[PDB]
Design a protein around this ligand. Structure first.
Ligand SMILES: CCCCCCCCCCCCCCCCCC(=O)OC[C@H](COP(=O)([O-])OCC(O)COP(=O)([O-])OC[C@@H](COC(=O)CCCCCCCCCCCCCCCCC)OC(=O)CCCCCCCCCCCCCCCCC)OC(=O)CCCCCCCCCCCCCCCCC
Ligand SMILES: CCCCCCCCCCCCCCCCCC(=O)OC[C@H](COP(=O)([O-])OCC(O)COP(=O)([O-])OC[C@@H](COC(=O)CCCCCCCCCCCCCCCCC)OC(=O)CCCCCCCCCCCCCCCCC)OC(=O)CCCCCCCCCCCCCCCCC
Ligand SMILES: CCCCCCCCCCCCCCCCCC(=O)O[C@@H](COC(=O)CCCCCCCCCCCCCCC)COP(=O)(O)OCC[N+](C)(C)C
Ligand SMILES: CCCCCCCCCCCCCCCCCC(=O)O[C@@H](COC(=O)CCCCCCCCCCCCCCC)COP(=O)(O)OCC[N+](C)(C)C
Ligand SMILES: CCCCCCCCCCCCCCCCCCCC(=O)O[C@H](COC(=O)CCCCCCCCCCCCCC)COP(=O)(O)OCCN
Ligand SMILES: CCCCCCCCCCCCCCCCCCCC(=O)O[C@H](COC(=O)CCCCCCCCCCCCCC)COP(=O)(O)OCCN
Ligand SMILES: CCCCCCCCCCCCCCCCCCCC(=O)O[C@H](COC(=O)CCCCCCCCCCCCCC)COP(=O)(O)OCCN
Ligand SMILES: CCCCCCCCCCCCCCCCCCCC(=O)O[C@H](COC(=O)CCCCCCCCCCCCCC)COP(=O)(O)OCCN
Lengths: 375, 63, 61, 161, 205, 438, 111, 82, 47
């Protein structure tokens, strides 16, 4: 019964915080900082390893910039779903966790839209829903065939590999991100383009979900780079950068380089924090430099990990493609710098809520030299 | 309909193997599908309430 | 108005009413200590600042 | 050397009025300066923010455009654009995403028309526009019912919201 | 060297050789050997057989391209309006022609490759360059002036890239290990492994 | 060494704490103090220590810094030419950009780690993208050109560095490693091919020089082109000699073609800065080929000729910038009668143009003699090819001088006291090196 | 109509309101010509008038590629002569197909 | 006045060419739905594909890239006609 | 200033760093499923 207590404490924590927030709901505290701190404390009871501590760190940094009890509660729900995705041992765990996370995404997207933004945000949420239904239905049908044929539910199969390709957002499965994250709140796009990936990477590494095929990561890299270079809108540029990088990280993870992808996801979270929560041009400039992989900042270390892992596996086509696609993506990042300082006078909203933005920029500048051992 | 088809396949496999895994996965499918449909119907109703007068078949995006 | 249970800090932001709980009283005394220490540090800084000390006062109407 | 200096004209002489048909069907007399682009003159008058959309070019989104209907006689003053460049790309996306079926042979975008003396008492109309989205802040639901002004928008252009 | 007086680098004696020493005591391999199907498809002995084995890839690619274009057309046609013309009569030529022309280009490429290798008798870069040149020439039969030059060059360059990074690159860096002692330098005192690291199992997807 | 590195780190540090009205004065004092620290580094560098004069490490392989013959010459050259850049540039933004660029470049020269070299050298990527693409007088196309060219070449170099770090376990120069792989050799080579402008990867340099400010052009020509030879002597020749000897006919083909076609392209120029920028490209090929011979003469001659170029081309760029300030034109056809109108500017212009044509009393002569001797050691025809086509440089230099020299002009455009102060150190250094104090 | 802007004493002030035009650095600026400016624009943007013609391909190949081919042949001949001169075995150059592995001479060996 | 690039073509003809992009725009879910479905089934079938030579794979990729039609190209040129 | 001692100390530091890196590069799979490759690792599963 003692082993069950570890999981049960997290429930009891979440429930009592929920009922306390429901009772203590007032206009005097619309920004419920106290429940945010309570949620952060409660999520410490789920840390058991380094990857779980990274999950906690990103979850807390995300919950800081959500406003209200309700959105923070659904971020806690996303954290629970992610924690169970890491611990899933067969098909049922994978399914339960990931469509719980999909439900949390739908709710978070719906509740952060204004009345004037409903026409496009609800359309994007609906399109995401239907595509996710396609993915889940195919997954569970093939899972039924596999469970019939083998008599057991084993998470080392092609079915879960393709389902996790959909979850990662690689090669033919990246369009839901483009449609949904273009029309949703910037924080929602930021937290759901970084945090979900860590659980999928952990599941792939631990449960041996790797394929010999390199087509999908190659397609992700080339398509992401070329579409980023051809995209006029800034949101599409940032969204396609993730497709390219996650294709490259998928190629690295299949070969067993778990440590490097676990560092890359964290450095990418920190790098994307500043450009998505754009309040200052200089912070966004450093963030864009970090995403490009540029040397003075921590983003150079994260990209260097992946590239260094590539030369070890000694696949020439991947390296050649990596160089050319990296140049193509660099052109789009340079477009982003040009738009801020070299096109026209720029005036932005004075949204002085840089909770972890200054800390993230400081970490990007500073952290390069301490982490140099990694590469 | 498709989710029900998959859940029925899992129940069929459970009967074939005399195992309880498919029964559990099927109740899981029922719950998750119902929750997804409720949220999606919420989004559909909200989408239809925000339609502008000029928009004609808002629900039929596939046209 | 609809509700009458609004927190006193919410109703009187300019000056909170006299502390009534023990914790509130301790916070009040700690604030008094902080105020005195801050004024002392202010005067010490004003000595280095030179003639005038960057002092400020209310102006006449 | 030292030819005669030409004194400048006062604002009254170099103001032309254009009659603009708005979406509701009312006709507005928009006083405008010669040498100004049509988009700027329309923005300064006080038309609502739904009436305008950013120029959908890589580096032109700070400019605010409108879908306008130009009489055949004034088609000459519209600016030529090179198809092999990206200005034509801005124009093609603005037709593809905003105008769509509402296009007519008189359809043009305001930035490519510059007001001059011969365009005095010209009658133009705002062309119908389809719902468009770039960012949640910069979007058009399809309802022309906000009473703000595009003038009162300090925000230069679309970036991450 | 880092000095201006004597040449940089060094030289190794050609007379002196160093006995090979194993990177580890026991070798466990997670890299699977080529399948018999791969060796069958790679076999260029009979040019007709080689062509017929490798064309399904080209036909598949042409079918996806034609399906993409045909769906772009189908998506546009209005369901609400009844159409006098038959849509499939419009759409079938697209897919069929795309697939046929793709298959023809791939057939020229594979046939010329196998024929050149048989006649030359050696596996070389030149077979791929000549097959690509012929395929690009077929691509630009009636096309305007830059294209007679550019397509033979691009189609010839593609097999060069495939050979350089698909065959030469892996074979050049087989020996390099990354663990224990550097492949050239075993005299240096580095931790010597009993077994090689297995970072992943042999794949089976 | 430690003092030099500390002062290099101190210069960008000072800008954060200065009053923003004292910035120019503080920056000039910091530049001169860095020059003095470089002189101290030369003093504490004993020739008895033949391999490396000085090596310092600050806790990791990346923090390993050291000076050799090439590194010491290039670092003294950059520290010498930086103050002139400082005085030429006005504004806190411009000062900040130029100081950060110089700190990164000067740290690259003394670095002994390929990855740290890459990290420091490419840190100045956006700074040039912003600098060359400045609001009124900059061009976005040139900034795009330079940024993309640098990114692709440096990424290839980075991939080769990763492979070396995986195979050997180290990528520091002080650890002896040799490789025969051609892919890694090309990965290291492509950076040198692009950074040292070598046909057909030379297109970025012209557009950058024309649309960069005079201080920016001075730094670019003075030391950023020389970073190629630091990379070649430090990170390519020690490890990739087998590949340079395998590809020597190809290397000569590309180098001599760059020399010839850059000389011919110079003839078609109407802009003074473009003329100087193309002269630089033709000059780089002799350096690259002389080093590639991997002989004692070649390395010394290449580093010497780099010093000669880094004393002659900054002077020409500075004089052209002064003339453009006085005239607001760079077209040779607009500029006439400069001999009568600007006798003092004309004297220095002719002196530096003679230096660029490698006349005996100039350092370019000694440097060229050594480089040609190395080429002659390889083969007679190699030297003969370079010696003949040097006449093309004379044609365009003489045409430019003749066009500027005489005519009718109604404007006195001659340099002020500030301008003469700006070039006096370069003239003195040119004379001192020309008499043999190379 | 003109006045001296510069003051050596250090009491320099820019008279932006002065009726007389200051003799500042812009005083000596070259007047410029409309057609010369258009010639400069044409000459810089000469890529607009680039057309692929058989004559253009002929010129580019015969001069550029011809010079590259000639230089490569001469360099290969010089390498062959030097190998015969030095007494080295025929070196394995990149595009030469040689069944010898000799690349770098051994300093210790006597050739 | 400044030297400027010559723009080929007439102003109204170029504007008429650009106006051929203003056509009824389908929503992208219809394409995405089919691509997702056929892509899932395609990934399932790929594991069963025979191993192809790298040269043939690269040539197939080149042919696919050449044969790919941008969605805007069909948009401008689409005619609801036989 | 003993240049010989400084040179040898610096070289020793770099060589030690290389040895440490090559030890650090010796990595088997840490996957929880992979009990064969890690048979000797001391672990407890709570599942
Ligand atoms: C203070 C001492 C700390 C030193 C050691 C730490 C261990 C003791 C933990 C003590 C707690 C200190 C926390 C520090 C680390 C946290 C780890 C941890 O906690 O669990 C690990 C620890 C044992 O796991 P392990 O040591 O990792 O070994 C297991 C296996 O080796 C499997 O694990 P593995 O994954 O490590 O396997 C080895 C791995 C080797 O992996 C490594 O080498 C690790 C490298 C270090 C990375 C460090 C960064 C990680 C970021 C997380 C930040 C920590 C957040 C703290 C969260 C917990 C707070 C207590 O090899 C791999 O290949 C796997 C890949 C690993 C990931 C790749 C690393 C990249 C990380 C990302 C870096 C990217 C840069 C970002 C920017 C950085 C710029 C400077 O578990 C515990 O000891 C118990 C956990 C209990 C936590 C909370 C429970 C107490 C409170 C309960 C009630 C709570 C409610 C009341 C609240 C009260 C307050 C109000
Ligand atoms: C009934 C349903 C209809 C669909 C039917 C099929 C259903 C799917 C079934 C299975 C799907 C899985 C496999 C399909 C391919 C995966 C792509 C995908 O699914 O992404 C979702 C994608 C939609 O995603 P999206 O985000 O909405 O669209 C992004 C674009 O911006 C879209 O916007 P955009 O169209 O306006 O812009 C297109 C843009 C987008 O950019 C791309 O397309 C990127 C593609 C680059 C290659 C991709 C990686 C190739 C690696 C293949 C790996 C296998 C081989 C391994 C070895 C190869 C080594 C490289 O590219 C272009 O601008 C046009 C050029 C296209 C290729 C560019 C490269 C040219 C190189 C040739 C040089 C020669 C020129 C020399 C002369 C030049 C003179 C100066 O759906 C599809 O497009 C599927 C259509 C299937 C047709 C593909 C035909 C061939 C397929 C195999 C050949 C592989 C080459 C790829 C060709 C282009 C494919 C896009
Ligand atoms: C080895 C370290 C390197 C590895 C890095 C990963 C490890 C991270 C370790 C350091 C983490 C530091 C994180 C810094 C976050 C910055 C603090 C912050 O965000 O405060 C917010 C917090 O905002 C909130 O929402 C408050 C609610 C939560 C308050 C904090 C909750 C504390 C919970 C307890 C956590 C204790 C840990 C539990 C036991 C481990 C306040 O900012 P705002 O008011 O929202 O806006 C700022 C406006 N402006 C700056 C422009 C003036
Ligand atoms: C705005 C400018 C106005 C001012 C004009 C200044 C006028 C300059 C006067 C011209 C000077 C000509 C002197 C040329 C000789 C160079 C001086 C020299 O190099 O000093 C020699 C000492 O030699 C002499 O003193 C030479 C004596 C000069 C007087 C001899 C007769 C004068 C006739 C001139 C002919 C000189 C031709 C030399 C050609 C190279 C240093 O001796 P070392 O210790 O051995 O130095 C090492 C050698 N190395 C420099 C290469 C590193
Ligand atoms: C990125 C490399 C792509 C090449 C770019 C070249 C320019 C593109 C123009 C397209 C022309 C088609 C590509 C031809 C390039 C091959 C070079 C021709 C040399 C040659 O014919 O020898 C072959 C071997 O060279 C070879 O085929 C292998 C040589 C590898 C090519 C050169 C690699 C470095 C070039 C990088 C230059 C700068 C990069 C910028 C593009 C024959 O050999 P054999 O074995 O068949 O013997 C014959 C027994 N029958
Ligand atoms: C297995 C893979 C098989 C091979 C597949 C190959 C596929 C293609 C790979 C090409 C990768 C190279 C990436 C560079 C692309 C060229 C630059 C883009 C052209 C361009 O328009 O950029 C504009 C300016 O760039 C400029 O002004 C720069 C001018 C050109 C730069 C020169 C290129 C660098 C040197 C090339 C070779 C170097 C050595 C190679 C080893 C800015 O466009 P915008 O920001 O306004 O966006 C608006 C969108 N239209
Ligand atoms: C066509 C003229 C050549 C243009 C180059 C002009 C001069 C450049 C020389 C640079 C000097 C050092 C570079 C090493 C070799 C580079 C190219 C040498 C010529 C070459 O391509 O030889 C090939 C061998 O090299 C190879 O197999 C690899 C070639 C380079 C690969 C291209 C891109 C690599 C990028 C890798 C990034 C870093 C990766 C690090 C892991 C084939 O000659 P062969 O011996 O097969 O003879 C068969 C003939 N019948
Ligand atoms: C598509 C792009 C290309 C299309 C256009 C290409 C047309 C150019 C073709 C002609 C180029 C000039 C001729 C050089 C190549 C000759 C044929 C190559 C075969 C060859 O190497 O023969 C050697 C030629 O003599 C030599 O060693 C070279 C003599 C000619 C060089 C001097 C003439 C020009 C001088 C100008 C200065 C250029 C060189 C500066 C160093 C002598 O045979 P072998 O005894 O060496 O044995 C070597 C065994 N084949």
């Amino acid at each position: 019964m003692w082993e069950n207590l570890w999981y049960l404490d997290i429930l009891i924590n979440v429930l009592i915080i929920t009922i306390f927030g429901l009772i203590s709901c007032s206009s005097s505290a619309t920004k419920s900082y106290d429940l945010k701190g309570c949620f952060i404390i409660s999520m410490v009871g789920g840390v058991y390893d380094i990857p779980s501590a990274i999950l906690w760190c990103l979850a807390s940094l995300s919950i800081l910039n959500f406003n209200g009890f309700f959105a923070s509660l659904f971020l806690v729900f996303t954290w629970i779903s992610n924690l169970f995705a890491m611990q899933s041992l067969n098909f049922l765990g994978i399914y339960l966790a990931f469509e719980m996370q999909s439900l949390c995404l739908l709710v978070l997207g719906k509740i952060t839209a204004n009345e004037n933004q409903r026409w496009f945000a609800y359309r994007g949420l609906l399109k995401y829903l239907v595509l996710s239904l396609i993915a889940g239905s195919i997954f569970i049908f093939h899972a039924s065939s596999s469970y019939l044929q083998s008599g057991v539910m084993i998470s080392d199969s092609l079915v879960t590999y393709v389902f996790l390709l959909f979850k990662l957002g690689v090669a033919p499965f990246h369009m839901y991100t483009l449609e949904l994250f273009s029309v949703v709140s910037r924080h929602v796009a930021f937290v759901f383009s970084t945090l979900p990936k860590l659980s999928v990477l952990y599941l792939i590494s631990n449960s041996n979900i790797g394929s010999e095929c390199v087509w999908w990561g190659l397609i992700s890299l080339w398509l992401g780079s070329i579409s980023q270079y051809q995209s006029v809108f800034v949101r599409s540029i940032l969204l396609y950068s993730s497709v390219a990088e996650i294709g490259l990280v998928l190629l690295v993870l299949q070969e067993g380089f778990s440590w490097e992808a676990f560092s890359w996801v964290s450095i990418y979270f920190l790098s994307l924090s500043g450009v998505w929560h754009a309040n200052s041009k200089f912070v966004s400039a450093i963030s864009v430099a970090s995403i490009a992989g540029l040397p003075p900042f921590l983003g150079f270390i994260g990209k260097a990990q992946i590239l260094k892992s590539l030369v070890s596996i000694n696949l020439g086509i991947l390296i050649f493609s990596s160089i050319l696609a990296a140049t193509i993506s660099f052109i789009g990042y340079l477009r982003l710098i040009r738009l801020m300082y070299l096109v026209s006078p720029v005036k932005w909203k004075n949204n002085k809520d840089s909770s972890f933005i200054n800390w993230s920029t400081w970490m990007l500048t500073v952290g390069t030299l301490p982490m140099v051992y990694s590469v | 309909i498709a989710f029900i088809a998959c859940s029925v396949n899992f129940l069929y496999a459970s009967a074939y193997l005399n195992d309880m895994a498919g029964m559990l996965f099927s109740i899981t499918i029922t719950t998750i599908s119902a929750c997804e449909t409720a949220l999606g119907l919420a989004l559909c109703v909200g989408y239809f309430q925000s339609r502008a007068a000029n928009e004609v078949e808002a629900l039929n995006l596939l046209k | 108005s609809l509700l009458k249970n609004y927190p006193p800090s919410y109703l009187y932001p300019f000056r909170h009413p006299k502390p009534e709980g023990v914790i509130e009283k301790v916070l009040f005394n700690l604030g008094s200590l902080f105020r005195s220490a801050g004024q002392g540090m202010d005067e010490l800084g004003s000595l280095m600042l030179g003639n005038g000390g960057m002092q400020e006062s209310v102006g006449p109407n | 050397d030292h030819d005669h200096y030409t004194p400048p004209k006062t604002v009254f002489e170099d103001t032309i009025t254009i009659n603009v048909l708005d979406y509701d069907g009312k006709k507005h007399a928009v006083k405008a300066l010669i040498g100004t682009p049509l988009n700027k003159a329309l923005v300064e008058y006080g038309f609502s923010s739904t009436y305008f959309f950013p120029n959908m070019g890589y580096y032109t989104q700070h400019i605010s455009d409108a879908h306008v209907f130009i009489p055949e006689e004034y088609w000459k003053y519209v600016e030529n654009v090179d198809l092999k460049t990206d200005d034509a790309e801005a124009i093609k996306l603005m037709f593809k995403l905003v105008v769509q079926d509402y296009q007519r042979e008189t359809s043009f975008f305001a930035s490519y028309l510059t007001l001059n003396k011969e365009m005095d008492n010209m009658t133009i109309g705002f062309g119908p526009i389809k719902p468009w989205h770039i960012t949640p802040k910069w979007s058009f639901n399809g309802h022309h019912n906000v009473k703000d002004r595009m003038f009162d928008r300090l925000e230069t252009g679309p970036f991450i919201e | 060297t880092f000095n201006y007086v004597i040449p940089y680098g060094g030289s190794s004696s050609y007379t002196i050789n160093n006995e090979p020493v194993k990177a580890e005591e026991v070798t466990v391999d997670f890299s699977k050997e080529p399948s018999a199907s791969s060796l069958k498809l790679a076999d260029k002995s009979d040019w007709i057989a080689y062509t017929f084995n490798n064309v399904p890839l080209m036909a598949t690619v042409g079918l996806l391209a034609g399906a993409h274009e045909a769906f772009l057309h189908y998506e546009r046609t209005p369901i609400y309006g009844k159409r006098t013309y038959n849509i499939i009569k419009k759409l079938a030529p697209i897919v069929i022609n795309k697939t046929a022309y793709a298959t023809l280009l791939g057939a020229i490429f594979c046939a010329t490759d196998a024929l050149y290798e048989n006649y030359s008798g050696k596996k070389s870069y030149t077979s791929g360059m000549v097959a690509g040149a012929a395929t690009g020439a077929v691509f630009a039969i009636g096309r305007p002036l830059p294209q007679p030059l550019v397509w033979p060059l691009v189609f010839a360059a593609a097999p060069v890239i495939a050979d350089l990074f698909g065959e030469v690159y892996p074979e050049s860096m087989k020996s390099a290990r990354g663990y224990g002692t550097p492949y050239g330098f075993e005299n240096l005192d580095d931790a010597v492994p009993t077994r090689n690291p297995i970072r992943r199992n042999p794949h089976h997807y | 060494m430690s003092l030099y590195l500390f002062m290099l780190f101190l210069q960008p540090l000072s800008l954060s704490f200065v009053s923003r009205s004292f910035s120019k004065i503080s920056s000039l004092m910091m530049s001169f103090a860095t020059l003095w620290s470089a002189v101290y580094m030369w003093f504490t560098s004993n020739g008895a220590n033949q391999t490396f004069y000085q090596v310092v490490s600050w806790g990791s392989d990346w923090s390993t810094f050291g000076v050799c013959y090439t590194s010491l010459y290039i670092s003294l050259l950059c520290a010498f030419i930086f103050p002139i850049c400082v005085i030429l540039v006005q504004g806190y933004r411009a000062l900040s950009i130029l100081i950060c660029i110089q700190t990164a470049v000067s740290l690259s020269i003394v670095s002994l780690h390929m990855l740290a070299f890459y990290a420091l050298f490419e840190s100045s990527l956006l700074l040039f993208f912003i600098l060359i693409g400045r609001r009124k007088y900059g061009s976005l196309s040139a900034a795009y050109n330079i940024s993309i060219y640098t990114f692709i070449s440096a990424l290839g170099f980075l991939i080769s560095a990763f492979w070396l770090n995986w195979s050997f376990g180290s990528v520091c120069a002080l650890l002896p490693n040799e490789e025969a792989n051609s892919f890694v050799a090309f990965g290291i080579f492509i950076l040198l091919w692009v950074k040292a402008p070598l046909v057909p990867f030379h297109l970025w340099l012209p557009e950058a020089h024309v649309y960069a400010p005079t201080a920016g052009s001075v730094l670019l020509a003075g030391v950023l082109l020389k970073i190629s030879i630091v990379g070649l002597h430090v990170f390519f020749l020690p490890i990739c000699a087998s590949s340079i000897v395998k590809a020597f006919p190809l290397i000569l083909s590309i180098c001599l073609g760059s020399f010839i076609f850059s000389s011919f392209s110079t003839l078609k120029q109407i802009d003074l800065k473009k003329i100087v920028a193309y002269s630089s490209i033709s000059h780089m090929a002799i350096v690259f080929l002389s080093s590639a011979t991997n002989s004692g003469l070649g390395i010394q001659g290449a580093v010497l000729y780099c010093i000669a170029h880094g004393l002659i081309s900054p002077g020409l760029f500075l004089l052209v910038g002064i003339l453009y300030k006085n005239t607001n034109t760079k077209l040779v056809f607009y500029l006439r009668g400069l001999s009568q109108q600007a006798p003092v500017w004309w004297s220095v212009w002719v002196f530096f143009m003679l230096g660029n044509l490698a006349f005996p009393l100039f350092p370019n002569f000694i440097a060229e003699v050594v480089c040609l001797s190395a080429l002659f050691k390889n083969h007679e025809l190699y030297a003969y090819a370079f010696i003949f086509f040097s006449f093309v440089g004379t044609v365009y230099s003489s045409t430019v001088l003749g066009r500027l020299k005489g005519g009718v002009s109604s404007q006195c455009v001659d340099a002020s006291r500030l301008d003469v102060i700006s070039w006096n150190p370069l003239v003195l250094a040119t004379v001192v090196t020309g008499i043999g104090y190379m | 109509s003109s006045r001296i802007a510069g003051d050596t004493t250090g009491k320099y002030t820019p008279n932006i309101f002065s009726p007389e035009t200051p003799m500042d650095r812009s005083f000596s600026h070259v007047p410029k010509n409309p057609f010369w400016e258009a010639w400069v624009f044409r000459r810089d943007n000469i890529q607009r008038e680039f057309v692929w013609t058989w004559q253009t391909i002929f010129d580019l190949a015969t001069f550029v590629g011809g010079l590259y081919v000639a230089m490569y042949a001469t360099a290969s001949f010089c390498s062959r002569q030097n190998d015969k001169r030095n007494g080295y075995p025929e070196r394995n150059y990149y595009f030469s197909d040689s069944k010898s592995n000799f690349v770098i001479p051994d300093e210790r060996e006597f050739y | 006045d400044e030297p400027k690039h010559q723009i080929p073509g007439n102003a109204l003809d170029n504007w008429a060419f650009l106006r051929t992009y203003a056509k009824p725009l389908p929503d992208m879910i219809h394409y995405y739905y089919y691509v997702y479905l056929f892509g899932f089934f395609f990934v399932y079938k790929v594991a069963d594909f025979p191993e192809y030579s790298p040269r043939v794979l690269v040539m197939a990729a080149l042919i696919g890239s050449l044969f790919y039609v941008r969605r805007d190209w069909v948009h401008r040129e689409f005619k609801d006609s036989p | 200033v003993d240049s010989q001692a400084e040179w040898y100390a610096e070289y020793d530091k770099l060589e030690k760093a290389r040895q440490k890196r090559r030890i650090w590069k010796w990595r088997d799979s840490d996957s929880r499923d992979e009990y064969a490759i890690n048979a000797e690792e001391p672990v407890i599963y709570i599942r």
